[model samples]
Target chain A: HASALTRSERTELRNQRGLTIWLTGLSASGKSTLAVELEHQLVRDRRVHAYRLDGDNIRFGLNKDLGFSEADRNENIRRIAEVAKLFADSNSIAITSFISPYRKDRDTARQLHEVATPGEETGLPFVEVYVDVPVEAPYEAPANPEVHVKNYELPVQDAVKQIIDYLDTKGYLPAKK
Target chain B: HASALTRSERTELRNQRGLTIWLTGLSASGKSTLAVELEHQLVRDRRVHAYRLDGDNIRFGLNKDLGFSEADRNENIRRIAEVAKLFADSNSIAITSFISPYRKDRDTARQLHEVATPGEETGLPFVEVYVDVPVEVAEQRAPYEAPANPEVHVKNYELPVQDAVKQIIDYLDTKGYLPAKK
Candidate 1:
């Protein structure tokens, strides 16, 4: 039972606490690269369990049979969201880089973030990071997002720093050990 | 960099493959209980890495300060979904037990399930097990859920077994890993 396991037990077993950093944007908007960088930064901490999931790899296996149709895309996001939820519950930080193009899909992903926690009926604090790229570069803005990173103009380092700062402020990243 | 790690290397290092079995229902509807049982069953399999996560413990910690408002609930699910994604990526059968009372929430969880497996997105299947207890009984236990759709419904041993078999068939078919059962 959940009661049987103490917080320390979970942390010790999983080797870290859990958190989800969902990155959404258009293709080539640097979602994967940034996720990788963030993951690198996170892993350097040593005490955290971090992993990154992006599109290209996902397409080759479990979702290979599915096409780019709306249903398939929804399934793509659906499966990723569920997987991410599991990681968060198990006390790990999961970074997902997906071009989840639609608002409905993104919202659905956000909702899954809420249900991952057990007793709490409320939603998780979904920090929506919009990987802002130029319109000329072929990307669309999220209808609304909590955090927006202007990739076209913003330096990658600056953007990464801002994101880390946001996470730290929100307590997703524990204060420097 | 993530690109540097080969698929098999990552799988080998993780020492497990990623998968999810999402148990959904109203509060105290036995979702957590069934999840624990399922975790035990998977452990008995021995070859797989498995773990279970539920709401109660989650609230006491990571999300301790959060409340049960709609927004909070959504955020809660998002966090868990992200965690589940990592577990799957590391190659473990991650089980999540939650009373995700709304259809949209379950749908979102399904979305997370697929995204966790980057590149090889097809083999991973999200199993939605609705722990169906009578509304009256559920209320007695805790709260009741009115699920709009679910991959499977479990109650007593017989129904669970039937559902489990069906799930296995679905899994086998999806994986293309077997001679078809006669």
Candidate 2:
């Protein structure tokens, strides 16, 4: 992640594709579990730079001042979206694990990445990976998620593989050098 | 930057040393230019992973919603500090270029890094570099508190950007900020 490298230059550098793999689900649907494994596999196993944005880090650090009010929730998601986009722009995979129960908030996060900013020709990719639980609550499920994993039925590796395969298919994970 | 690796594990992986080199100065004191060059040199020349947190990136992106009120300004610096620390925790150098006129705000930022959090044993290093400018060039209404004991102080703006960058790089290297290559 060089400050001198442009978005195109970053893409060409090791063919690194910076994008957000947003996992939305309920508390018990294994969003954090999948995110942890996904991040481990991406960085340690695959030799790619990746970071996870979840409650453990965000609530304690960036959004510590914020609370659970409606406005606070929106602001929380907003900041996460912006920061995830920033990580992606820096050519690192931003794996965001949040319940993000509202469809509007999730869509807003997607649009934040979809809309190109000042320097870029095209917007960064925003992959919505939904960790679905057959028995869920309060979660506005993604209508057209990029990867839909049935968390209750699948193992962590299987769920991670689905997301990884999706990333590979979309040319985000080009054959590593 | 990796999520799964502990701070120790990341250090073992590539010997990556994550810390913040915070630049505080006047508007024309060349913090942004110095930050850009430093980031470039660290990443390309040294093969280290580093990211810059400046107005160009922070104002228009993360703090876009924030205004310039007293509370907003505090929140502004607060968020910047948190994000920079997060980047440092992720095994990347966070180069923060900001005027940060108030000593309290700047000190608060330093303290945030100085205090250890949940998982880590020790706090990340915070190298405060005061980019000083002449009275004719500086000009601050909010009153800039010159750093009493900055890690690196830049008084001569006449030097080439690289010269200034080299000084900071030298300081980092001396402080063992530059990690061993894998």
- Give all candidates' CA lDDT scores: 0.62, 0.80
Query: Which residue ranges in model 2 land beyond 4 Å of their true spot?
Result: A1-4, A13-15, B1-4, B139-141, B180-182
The number of clashing residue pairs in each candidate reads 87, 0
Score chain B of candidate 1 by TM-score.
Answer: 0.72
| Model 1 chain B poorest 10 in a row by lDDT | B172-181
lDDT by residue for model 1 (A41-112), tens:
665543345676656655654345568777777777876666555556555677777777667777888887
Q: What TM-score, over all chains together, does every model reach?
A: 0.52, 0.91
Candidate 2 contains a number of clashing pairs equal to: 0
Tens digit per residue, CA lDDT, model 1, B91-151 = 6666787657777887787786665344564545566777766666655632344556666
Judge candidate 2 against the unseen true structure and give its global Cα lDDT, from 0 to 1.
0.80
DockQ of each: 0.09, 0.41
* Native contacts conserved, per model: 0.15, 0.31
**lDDT tens string, model 2, B31-80?**
77888888777876777767777755578778998887989888888898
